[PDB]
Amino acid sequence: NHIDVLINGCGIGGAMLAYLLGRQGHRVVVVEQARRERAINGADLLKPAGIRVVEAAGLLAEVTRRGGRVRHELEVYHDGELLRYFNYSSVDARGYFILMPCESLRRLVLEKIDGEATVEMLFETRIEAVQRDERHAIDQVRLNDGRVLRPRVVVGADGIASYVRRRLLDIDVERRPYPSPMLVGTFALAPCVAERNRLYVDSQGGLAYFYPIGFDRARLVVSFPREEARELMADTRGESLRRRLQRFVGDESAEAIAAVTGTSRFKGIPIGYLNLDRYWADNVAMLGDAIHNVHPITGQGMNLAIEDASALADALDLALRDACALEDALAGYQAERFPVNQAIVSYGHALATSLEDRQRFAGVFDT
Ligand SMILES: Cc1cc2nc3c(=O)[nH]c(=O)nc-3n(C[C@H](O)[C@H](O)[C@H](O)COP(=O)(O)OP(=O)(O)OC[C@H]3O[C@@H](n4cnc5c(N)ncnc54)[C@H](O)[C@@H]3O)c2cc1C
Ligand SMILES: Nc1ccccc1C(=O)CC(=O)O
């Protein structure tokens, strides 16, 4: 019943890790509490560092074949006037980003895992209990199907409310909510949205970000102070939201506003602030939202899960092929990822708290 790696969670992070380890013939069991087909919804953005992972995994061609869109521009408006235009390819030819729904990319990765004979995905399954040895390493894990496994490594890829973090590592994280929630809705695609990503903010705390997703749809991500957000979502025919948008979204995006036909299909987006001091202990390591939570205004939640998965796959491959001890590989993982994750967590908070103040917001961008 010896395996190399037990991964708790089959989100984008855990799926990517499973796939990269499986490609090397490592014996992997992935435990996921949900059904495989549970349509989750998540982040839509891949940044250059995430794209590098997807490309190295051999998946980049397939991403655009399945509705992923290459982009290299963003317009940012404040109080209806253009504050910044960013052209990410204006120095770096490979500066581009990709818009790809998390669930589409995850389905692609699962299709690859289906072809890897050393990886076993267990859906509608959870860990029940673990047993530690005299060195304090997890050596036996019992699942709620009664299966017992003996993994060399246990990974928490189990997201924002990580079971591994809370129940195996005994970490409690301080909750510090933001006063403005964020919501995302999917609408018909207007030509203006097809043309260029446009982010709008105003001095009263409003945010509206319009961008295309898949072949023939568009997202609108909004943020308002909580009580206002409540009132705008309550008028379900969308008239209050559309008129609030018209206060800070100019006519370039008028057709995108008109596409907002109601509010009933908006979904909340979680908003945390976290970067754990330790990404690992003993033979247990964590990735993605289990270890950090970035403000979703950064767009980077999926991207950082993928970057972490790739780093952790590198570290675990070294340890499992006996190129170094596990504790040294896990320390190297943390050395590599902690600074990157820390910068984006700090930057997300700096963006979210500067929105209303035009000069400060611009200053956060310039870095
Ligand atoms: C609707 C929505 C919109 C979002 N939009 C944005 C955005 O605009 N910008 C942004 O930066 N981020 C956004 N996010 C956050 C982003 O998707 C996450 O950062 C990303 O999914 C993290 O990936 P992960 O693999 O670490 O965790 P997840 O994708 O959360 O995957 C974790 C997996 O673990 C499983 N799991 C949990 N507990 C257990 C258990 N006990 N046993 C077994 N399995 C378990 C879950 O079922 C899940 O499949 C959004 C999230 C949502 C839901
Ligand atoms: N990148 C962003 C910038 C401002 C507001 C929201 C987002 C996102 O929410 C993108 C995503 O869905 O990953």
Residue numbers in the entry: 4 to 370
Give sentences from the paper.
In this study, we show that the catalytic activity of the flavoprotein monooxygenase (FPMO) PqsL can be triggered by blue-light illumination. The enzyme is involved in the biosynthesis of 2-alkyl-4-hydroxyquinoline N-oxides (AQNO) in the opportunistic pathogen Pseudomonas aeruginosa. It is homologous to group A FPMOs13 and has a relatively high similarity to p-hydroxybenzoate hydroxylase (pHBH), the most thoroughly studied FPMO14. In contrast, PqsL catalyzes the hydroxylation of an aromatic-amine group, a rather uncommon reaction, and remarkably shows no intrinsic catalytic activity with NAD(P)H as cosubstrate.
